[model samples]
Target: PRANTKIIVVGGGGTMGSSTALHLLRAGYTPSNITVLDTYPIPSAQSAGYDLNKIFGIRLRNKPDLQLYLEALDMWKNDPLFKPFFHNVGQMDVSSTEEGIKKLRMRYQSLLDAGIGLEKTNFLLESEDEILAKAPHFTREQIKGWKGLFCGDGGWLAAAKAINAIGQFLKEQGVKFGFGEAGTFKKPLFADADEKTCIGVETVDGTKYYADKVVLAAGAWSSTLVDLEEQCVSKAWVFAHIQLTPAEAAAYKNTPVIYDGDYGFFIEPDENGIIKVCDEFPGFTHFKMHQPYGSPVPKLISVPRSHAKHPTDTYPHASEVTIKKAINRFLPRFNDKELFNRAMCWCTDTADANLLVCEHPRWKGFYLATGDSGHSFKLLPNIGKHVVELLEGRLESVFKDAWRWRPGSGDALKSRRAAPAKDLADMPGWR
Candidate 1:
């Protein structure tokens, strides 16, 4: 309402933080009034190496959460100011068995009936010839019993670049931002008295400034601040390790983003020519690096097999290159015994496989907008719009029941889709 009312945002370097800042700025918050505080220097150049190593990150799943991503995809497809990579490589769930193929059909039908658009589209490629015709490198033998259900709208986005676009837009708008931590806040009082919000933040050296309101886009580190930790109480976030090779990397040059059921994997190609791969289920957990002066710790870990329990309490020690070896079981093209096998790992966070989005019951000025599980990258642009709408009290209906940080409320989750009981009973791990 007033220029004197400042909004201080802590932890603005990460994807969530940077995007959140851009969204807030677009929501009419003046650049001079908004300050993005973070612990580390914003990454200047997030480059993928051209060393023939396959590189991929999280892939968006075509589940209930897909609509949000489609919104971002549409923007990426048309917006000139933003040039984030959006490759709609149709997904293939390789099923060698007739049973698996039937199951795939059932799954596809169920998804279609559940209000997902673009199902049964004529643009879908049917056979290996169709796939290889699009990307000539995919061997036919690799796709046995692989019937494709093409959803032309689904795809992947260049996440780092998208965040950069948001940053550039916010900067151009003169959004007031800084690098620091949200140290403390002085609360509000009487009817007419304006609340003493995050007057300002303190740098690593204890220097402070003043702001009117505060937004916690701090991502994983948000779990620490008293104002934001409540949102993480029921939240779960993690990291993953991936391994790839130069040949595999090259194969993805024309490859659309893929989510493979046969291998429980999702792949994304990077500009530097590396393919990043990881799983879509169970999600990843947060990892904290032991630092001397409280550095901004943002390490993440992926879910391990049951034998590798306790993944969250401790950092995973598995080598990224070693994890890539497991790719042999899923990807048919991974026969290079002499492949370089370069491996790397990074962390991402999620909440109950859906986002922890809602509004704070008590903190009227605050709203929960992150924790998109692993499938959130392509959806941020549209998500940015949704969040801004909610902030402006426009989309209150979508979140009328979303009470942030309310334990056991169950309103935050949309609901799990379960297969027929007989099928569930027949599942391999079912008792």
Candidate 2:
């Protein structure tokens, strides 16, 4: 069906966009007919996946996601362009409290009972002693009674490099790239007065490009491009990076990426020898969209108007202090130093943290590939396939139903109540 259909992917220079374009090429679509449009360069820092390190694994809450993770892992490990950027150093999940241990046991048993062939992912369940052995710097007393799970096949990826490689590959395959704010879509092109089917998009500069199909993979800013209020919301996450001395790097180089489940803290070493500590603390902020005259914003969407400008990379000072304190509680050795370079990243989140991949209910020939919820960077390898599957009408009904756009679905708002609170005093503590 795609043999003669021309496709346009918005935000194509970024992770999901590039992946979707590459998969379209691989799926027998003519490269000349596929175009990717982005507001910045292919490896723009504004892109979520342009970061240095990303953890990869199959440790998801559901079987479908696990299967997708496994498929993505295969691509990361075996894809010629992606393999070089992958570090198969493995990942560890540590729990220092009874509640944390309970969560790990339930998660472990769920994965085991799912029978998803996790052995290939080198899954291993471990105790406190095993965790300290792998992460020697973590004191035995700190890790005592900790329940851990390690995935030998799980590791980190140099996100920027992988995305650049894919972009380059797509370029070689003849996928066109338009870079500049002018290339961004000002509005969707419709097929008729009723606007039942979108046929293309008009750029900010008044340039129009027509295509048989269009996908919105614009990440957090996706809400600005399409009406996704009923399906997803954009949220920002804050992270702080602290430089480690060469000796300190060597001492922790062998340490697996550490995730303290109960505490909501995660730490991983980057390629630059810097350790980044971040949290999943709840609540988020948003920015407004620029809708000029003649620009057609989606009629079905309702977004709160923001008069204040918000920077994507703005670092909230409070978040930095909170992160540093939390990380220091786990790694006491870093308490003497100051954290540097704070950053805030954005993500498109949906209720239940599930990937939304389905057709637009009101517009035919239009689709969505968003709702990443800060966990989709690792799924870039296989996520595009699902987008293409939807375009070709070959996607399974289960996924379609799960990701469909449901009007007045207040779950997206209700889900915020489940997020962890900002206070850490009551949770498991190391100091």
Candidate 3:
């Protein structure tokens, strides 16, 4: 084991990169030997993983994936340095349509078949009256044939706070972190004339930082670094923040994170006493890269920006109105209240919605850990372990197969809990 093998990680400002750095440090990599680069400040709001809120639980429908989630949960609960950020407030899955109900039943049985205990999870086939009792916000007419599923251990986490904590810890241990405008990846520096191995990276300012290994965990901005257009596409999703008064906070203090599966939306209380909701319909998509620059690296110079606007920008009123309908139906309390803030966030979406974490087939010493597909925040705590294993050539076949690169038509997304609304008119909103 070489303690001095240098490593350079791009996009260290986001959750995946920070966690990867932490795990590397824990594995005995010398802090002085690793460097993290980012275009913005660490934990910047511009990064998708830097958001104020995210849900965490064993909510995966696949048996093998559920085990991975439980491992992540164990790390969060037992690891003292990161435990304070975990807010175990429980989570609920509610649906009003037969299709939605089928998804719930399949998820429940999957967990049971995987040997998860009954005490940790629960299910409900409630009538309209029963649904109203749990949360008075929903009207009987609205939830007539609705069913619900509950997981006691599920809850939300302060994602940005956790990222900051990990970044600070790594800094104290001597991990080199360069943030702000100057910390940009210009191109991959190859070791040979044939470009078969990426040995380092050059920043925007023409400064070369060499490393024995390189990991690109850039999240939505990954396409800018590699030629992944054939494997994944970048998508911009919208999130709305509503200011909740003291009374409203207290009224919903114990409300579990609610996902309206029948509709294409989710509602949850942020740690800051504000209500946040998001629409998960086919989010805005385009084959684009944030920064375009010429490089000796094959993919960096020819990257494309498909959309007119950056994904971090705000959406038009029509998009907001589409999301609001679901919010109004579930929590009528905010029908009259105006939105306090709204913003767009981006993630790399693969066709099957499974993550892509593997080495470059042609370039040795180069690896990728992107393709979040909008639901990888919860796996941050332990995903780095698998990434490290891949780098060391000790990764298990199960994960190696799951994360290998594959391109498709983007029609089959297995990760979503329910089908998305077909159009603006079909979206769930106010009556």
Candidate 4:
């Protein structure tokens, strides 16, 4: 592909999609030759990226985790486009359960084993005093037996704002855009009757976009738009906000992101005096009969219900209960605070919890850049750089292998999480 290579990024208002579009321009592709189509403008309201905060930390799950995290951190800290949004307040993971504590020890050891100087920034706090060193809001009695992992480099990302920054850059570069029904994906446009080549895509409104290359970074909506052969299972997670008084917010200013596997996590307060809290649990799904592109017939798939479309919608009753539990455990002082803006954000998982970034095996020129597995927002500043490499067939072998087009490799529904506890069908009050 040349600098003028025409590219179309489906779901381009979201995280991976927006990153791809932005990276494409940075790669010298003519801004005029690129098209970003999505249901909303940049910073798509439906995108999981459209959130107040997302945790940023060193993830060591996949083969390329360390490499990716380091590069992303560098960009987030140095790149002018991303620097403003990277809050280096730090992040802490605490666990009181025996199993959770053991896992933290193993994780700490693994980080040290990487020989990447992780010891310089990572610490294992086995005492309440040490835990308080990083998180003072918790009383000693509250974390009597808790074990903590403090990552000096970990922090929080201003999720929606950063994606909006990318969108702003794209607009300044004169990139084309489509929104509303004109941007919703309906199906891929084939280049020929006998070929599996993807020339572009057709929006739900019947608008046709032709391009030399196409990328589907629809996040949780990927499997719904195209047949993925069960490689990806979409699931929804819940979060809610609580407004704090100015004094209360000041008392917790610059607090590290606090997480507990046995419970949930909470990020520091935003400038609006709002704090977001969420529980740790197996995600919820909504299964329905639908026919995606390339499917012979309608099949059961887990579809995402976007709050972006239905502003009145909230998370399930179970989610509300769990989020409340998290608040009580993490901030007892604010446990009585009224929770507001509760909603379900979505993500898709591969069986291995790695990315599903690769060229569609059956559709040449079409790429899949999803499979966030609920841990991808941290990659906002760097994931697209690799997506572009994958597009040009220059991605590193490790990522290529990790994100290969392999379906039926394992149980995606249970990928890296406990079994699905309930579906949206069984859970009420979210509609």
Residue ranges of candidate 3 with Cα displaced over 4 Å: 61-64, 118-120, 128-142, 264-268, 288-312, 407-431
Report the lDDT tens digits of candidate 1 across residue range 260-352: 454444454455544544432332232232221112343222211211122223222332332343355445555453322222222223323
Per-residue lDDT for 1-431 in model 4, tens only?
55868899998999999989889988999999999999999999999999999999987988989898999999999999999999998889988888999999999999999997999999999888998888887888998889999999999999999999999999999999999999999999997885489999999989999998899999999999999999999999999999998999987899999988878999989999999999999898889988799888999999988898888989888888889999999988997899999989999988989999999998999999999898999998889999999988899998999999998899889898878536899988888
Models 1 onward score TM values of 0.67, 0.88, 0.87, 0.98
Q: What is the C-alpha lDDT of each candidate?
A: 0.45, 0.71, 0.70, 0.91
Please write out the lDDT profile of model 3 over residues 1-431, one tens digit for every residue.
64878888888778778778888898889999988988766774567877777888775633247667877888778777667777776677787678888878887776676664744556564566655665665667767777877777777877888888887888789888776545677778898878898998888788888899988888877766666644655666677778777778776776677776544445456656788788656664443224432233444221222221344345556667866886776776677778755666677666666778888777788888887877888887888888878878898887888788665645422234244312222323311
By lDDT: ranked, best first: 4, 2, 3, 1
Output the lDDT of residue 83, model 2: 86
Candidate 3 TM-score versus the reference: 0.87
Provide the clash count, candidate 2: 0
lDDT of 1 at 376: 51
lDDT comparison, 1 vs 4, better candidate: 4
lDDT of 4 at 269: 92
CA lDDT of 350 in candidate 2?
74
Badly placed stretches (over 4 Å) of model 4 are none
Pick by lDDT: which candidate is best? Answer: 4
Model 3 pairs whose backbones collide: 325-428, 325-429, 326-428
Candidate 4 lowest-lDDT run of ten: 414-423
